[PDB]
Design a protein around this ligand. Structure first.
Ligand SMILES: [Ca+2]
Lengths: 146, 141, 146, 146, 141, 146
């Protein structure tokens, strides 16, 4: 697929669509690509999304492939800003800094011999496992299972 | 909340519900809990789901709560019709597609921040780009 | 030109279009770009196409040009996946393995000195030379000229 | 196929047919045959075309074939003759000298195991890959894909 | 944005549009992208334009985004009418006027700050003083 | 030209003219001159502009000049202030400090043998290249080209 905007909904009372515009490929790794939500107050607080596909070297004739594997990594960074003062004096506006950065990192290990069905299974089922009542209780409510 | 069955839909043409029964906490680590789908051929191929919540000790602006959700879907080898000796081998695992997701949530982060990161990452796994990368194995250009 | 799908016709009775989706630039070498035909049986057997442009470091003031040269390499790989038969030692069918790989490699050496007309000439005339009755007889029917 | 003239069109505004008369097999290597375009200014600048078929020694009884391979190499050389200017040291105009040589080299690796369909596929699809808009942009306009 | 032709006007009596076709990213550095004006005599004299955007890695109040715009306008030597041997030399570059501009933009800097620095520097290159220094080679006294 | 005020327009909705009064030559380098926009809240936040012309030593009789070069450097500094509190208590006003400094540095390398036409070309065309839609997308919108 081509590089396009990626739109993801907020978790507010009335959800707000955040649009991640593609920034481009990573400077140092050609296998990871970067989108950015530039709606925040300064770039220090912009939210970032990165997707990475790592393919193995092409198979050789007669080579045994049951150990070659493909990796996919999705990563989201949502830095939160803070400000030292909330007003503006004599044209000097408050300049926010980063306060903390919640983030998430997901990695799929897909062995090259796997079926399209296996890949659809692992993708759908993991994405669903992130939305189970237990997952919500652990990530949002910070309560383990007893 | 108390641990109970976790039901997750298949990705077949007609989806099939897989029910992960709670097995219990990991003997080595009390922070990670295991559910298991026992519908497969033999227990070596049972699908597994682990959820882990690591809270820092009660007490310093670098204190972060971690949450790890992991899904393993091992695929067993099909029953053999013939071997060199005539005795069928033990059930063996052919390959294992798996997934590992980790949330890093600073202790200062508000409930709104946590809801945001969870919803938005889960959605980021279902984008057209994510589906092209994981299912069709295509990069973005 | 922005990277896009490359569609090339088969050589069957009724030609079948193969669509090569870009994978992207080689992480090991940035001067070579990769498209992949995902219509095969499993990824190890996906056909691939690679195009490489190697331009020399820019000319310097008073420098001598008469040896600086540009290279372009187009390569196509069409690996044929092995078809499984009954495995008798373990009764476990083997991982998908590549049986053999028919491939082609074309390299243009274009000296920087050369004119656009020279480059158009060499490209067109070589691409035609690959379609001559003699080339067809050598590659397809394995016959020399006498 | 008996050796005969090979006629290939130019890339000019009005294409001009170049006729390559066979010179014959290379005396040093019998598996490579040579045609020559004699329309240039003097023989040193005659364009040349070479086709090579390397078939392996015949399969032997009980021998293993899985590595034996056939190679076909088509090569085109279009040397550009230097245009003379006034010689000032001796006042004697120089012998015809080749200024630079744009050239192209294509090698097909066809494993003996491969079927006629495989060979037709690789030949047609590579010859087409040399005519894609991307190949035209790289060879003629010196632009990569991004 | 996707890369496309960049058209820049000459400084002739009647200006002439030079069209810089995108060549692509630099093989050595993925952060710098190259356009090329191919209207000159031979490729050694093609005019070039490079734009580079260096973002710091996602993660500390000394984190700065850099942007470098560079223009090269090499001037080739004219075709020779006579040499010592009678063979004309390969196209050679006589001299190269060039320009290099670098923006240092702290990550805390707001869109207004970035618009200010870009507009104001670009204007600073067109002041009467700048024109006297670059074109007429005169200092201010 | 004489040292005079330099007036440059803001990028606000309704642009505001900033007037850079000449401060004078640099203390340590006699080849770089300094203007300053003193409209800001305290000198820590004043905006500065510097122009530098570096000429080579005069040519010697019979000396070959194809390596001597002239450099011109224009530099703009726009520090942004921040304040700890926005009101005044008991006659104590808030005193701002510097928060961050966006800046820009441009260097022309003009070989001494270059024509007035070459210099006008490089000046105009670079100044224009700073205002292209791509330059605006990269500096203001922080998006690379893909
Ligand atoms: Ca692109």
């Amino acid at each position: 697929p081509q590089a396009a905007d990626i739109v993801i909904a907020d978790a507010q009372a009335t959800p707000v669509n955040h649009t991640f515009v593609p920034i481009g490929p990573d400077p140092k790794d050609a296998t990871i690509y970067w989108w950015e939500d530039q709606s925040q107050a300064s770039p220090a607080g912009y939210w970032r999304l990165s997707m990475q596909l790592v393919r193995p070297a092409p198979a050789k004739a007669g080579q045994n492939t049951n150990q070659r594997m493909i990796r996919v990594r999705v990563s989201t960074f949502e830095p939160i800003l803070e400000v030292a003062v909330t007003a503006t004096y004599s044209g000097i506006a408050p300049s926010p800094t980063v306060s903390y950065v919640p983030k998430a990192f997901t990695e799929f290990v897909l062995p090259e011999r796997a079926t399209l069905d296996n890949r659809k299974d692992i993708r759908k089922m993991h994405a669903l496992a992130l939305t189970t009542s237990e997952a919500i209780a652990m990530i949002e409510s910070l309560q383990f299972v007893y």
